Design a binder for these strands. Sequence first.
RNA 1: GACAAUGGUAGGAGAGCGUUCUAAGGGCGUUGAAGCAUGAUCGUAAGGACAUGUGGAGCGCUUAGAAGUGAGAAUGCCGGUG
RNA 2: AAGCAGUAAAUGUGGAGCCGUAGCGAAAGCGAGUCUGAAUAGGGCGUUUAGUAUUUGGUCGUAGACCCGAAACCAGGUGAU
RNA 3: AGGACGACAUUAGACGAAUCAUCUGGAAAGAUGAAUCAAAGAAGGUAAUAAUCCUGUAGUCGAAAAUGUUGUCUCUCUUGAGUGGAUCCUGAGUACGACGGAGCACGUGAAAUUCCGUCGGAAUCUGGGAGGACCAUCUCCUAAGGCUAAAUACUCUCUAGUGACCGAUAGUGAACCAGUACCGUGAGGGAAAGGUGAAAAGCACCCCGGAAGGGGAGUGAAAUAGAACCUGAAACCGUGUGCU
Lengths: 59, 64, 144, 192
Amino acid sequence: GKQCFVTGRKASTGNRRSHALNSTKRRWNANLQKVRILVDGKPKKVWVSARALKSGKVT
Amino acid sequence: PKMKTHRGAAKRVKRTASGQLKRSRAFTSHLFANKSTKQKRQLRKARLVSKSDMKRVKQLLAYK
Amino acid sequence: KLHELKPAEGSRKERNRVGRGVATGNGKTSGRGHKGQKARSGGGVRPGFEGGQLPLFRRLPKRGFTNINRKEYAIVNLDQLNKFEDGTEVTPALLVESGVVKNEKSGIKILGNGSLDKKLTVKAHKFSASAAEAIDAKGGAHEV
Amino acid sequence: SIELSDAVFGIEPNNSVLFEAINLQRASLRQGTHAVKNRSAVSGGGRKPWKQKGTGRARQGTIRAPQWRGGGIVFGPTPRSYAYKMPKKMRRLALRSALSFKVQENGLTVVDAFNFEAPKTKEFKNVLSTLEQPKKVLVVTENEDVNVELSARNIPGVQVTTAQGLNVLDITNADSLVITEAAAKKVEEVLG
RNA sequence: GACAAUGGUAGGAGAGCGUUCUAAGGGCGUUGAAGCAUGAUCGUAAGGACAUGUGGAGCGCUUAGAAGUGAGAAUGCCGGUG
RNA sequence: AAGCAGUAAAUGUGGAGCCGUAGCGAAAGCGAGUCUGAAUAGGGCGUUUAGUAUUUGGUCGUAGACCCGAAACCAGGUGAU
RNA sequence: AGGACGACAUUAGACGAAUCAUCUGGAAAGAUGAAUCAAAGAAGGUAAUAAUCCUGUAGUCGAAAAUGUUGUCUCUCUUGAGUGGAUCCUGAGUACGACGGAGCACGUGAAAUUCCGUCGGAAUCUGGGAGGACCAUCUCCUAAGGCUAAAUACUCUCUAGUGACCGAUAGUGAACCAGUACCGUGAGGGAAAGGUGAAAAGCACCCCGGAAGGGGAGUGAAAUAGAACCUGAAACCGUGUGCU
């Protein structure tokens, strides 16, 4: 699917429990954002997680 | 495989020298305003399991 | 002689074979009685609890704990000390090589059941208060 | 000449340990490689063939059931080991009982060093004839002797061994013992 | 040698017959093996022999060992035949 | 016991260990006595110490567990001639 | 990290000891006599049951060429420790915390150690972590970069060999020209079928019949051994008869 460009962040899978511990499978997505970052060859717009966008990037 | 012991029986008994088991007494948990002061004082002493239950539950304690 | 062999008398028996004839008395039903849950390939009930009324170790209360630093001692009564000649300062090394103690668990403890009747110099980890008197009333000392 | 010791050759034989030593050595030679297919392992099945009720035929579930011709052995063989063990003192006592039986039967016969410099079966056949031994013989020595086992290994009924390789079965199977004056003391020093 | 006892299901105890294979000993076989057919034989039972025909090459006995160990009935499976 | 050696032999070496020789008590811990309790005062369990390894037989537990048998339930595909 | 340097192993093979006569027999390996070999008495065949008839076994010998592994010689590579201490370096959105999960034998529990998604977010040798909440003193260690052989698991396959494993309803579903007749639109399911004789010597010829099939006569030790071929049983189907 999608995944963070700079780092490798990607959705994981786990359980979701009720108040009686009834388990049911669910996902945990990453906080991906469409950001136009500046690589040479061309400035391209890619997925980047908001965790990598803090403190250091080109935009 | 190795035979598995009963883990909830092993928390309620202990083996004497003859091989008899020393159990504890039921009816000593709560509601003490309803039991006599003599029937409360004699439920405080441990006793041995019977011949019949030893007939029944004695493989569950083959390692104890 | 390999053509003339006999087991010791009373050493071997015939196994019993059910399901083979009525003369045996185990041929039909194989000693399992008539229709029931105890007469089915598979089996009966779990041992002890049956699914019925409340089991015995679910009707009595639990008790006590287990001490993690429980120290157990290898016991040596006084009478086992008689296998040693007079003098012969006894230590946990000589006491294991001699052949009285096998597994020095947390040390050795000299207990006082029996008669000493010798003049030893026992060096152990702990003494009983009725073994020190015995080891010192026949003449002799004891270091811990 | 004669070389013996009453605590390895004067033992009253123990028949009850000798039987178990023989049966143990016999049970330990079995491979045990025998198997058979069951309902899980026979190809086919997985489909009820007659639809249960509504058909006059008996209700069935598989074409590989233990009753159908062609599939399903109920409790057949399976590859299992047969060897067992017994205490060391019982092993030693069994050997001592076998050797004492050879002595009491008047089987044992000590001789000086076997001297063969080149393998030859004529020589060994003649040596046995001179000593007038029975057809089944056990030639014992102190170590491996490469000219006493190369000879007397194509002869019928002659078995050659060493002092640290004595069985209870090979001794109880022979008729006579031809030991040397080294292997005699070697076995007396191992046992006894 | 005298006295008594001996019906039996479920099931509990004991002693045994027979089948295939293995070890060791001792045997039989083209002057005819096993199998298979008949017989008016023996044993308290399971079962064991012998004679004749056939057949056409293997097979018992003793003492121990190990089991895919003995079937009239499962609207049992397969084959044959009413 | 595993390991090592050796004919996948059967046979030596190996003693980490494991059961027993001492129990009692929730435990600290005392020791043929201990735990309770103010206290042997009495009572409970002991001092009953011959056990241990291998193995035939009976029974139980974990494995489908004496044999045959559902109405179904889940997963992956094959089907609109 | 690229190359050059003689011994072994695999892939065909060769040599390989020692027996003759009589009886029964269609046939000798069997029985009866004598005799030999053996580092070879494993096994299979041979007209029956062979250490000495054949193929073999114990032992020894062999390789143009391809491959594998291996020893030495080259071919490379390549300055190793001890002191001194001013000061500088020692893996950062990382460690860790809160919320939601998972994983640890350990079910959120007093839960340490370890991972994930979202937010917040350290120190720099007086540093940083662990010793089952947490704190102090002691002891052990130095995360947030990476590589690595042996002991270990399994067998489509090749080379030898073993079995108190089956012996054609058994053993592979398949000893047969089987995953095939077939059966289904399809995915897929699935059988049943062994044996003449030592050697085809597998019936020249005559007779009845259109042929099939016989009856002879020949082959054979045997033809109720004639290819619907070892043996040939029970149910079932007949023909004759002793008593009723």
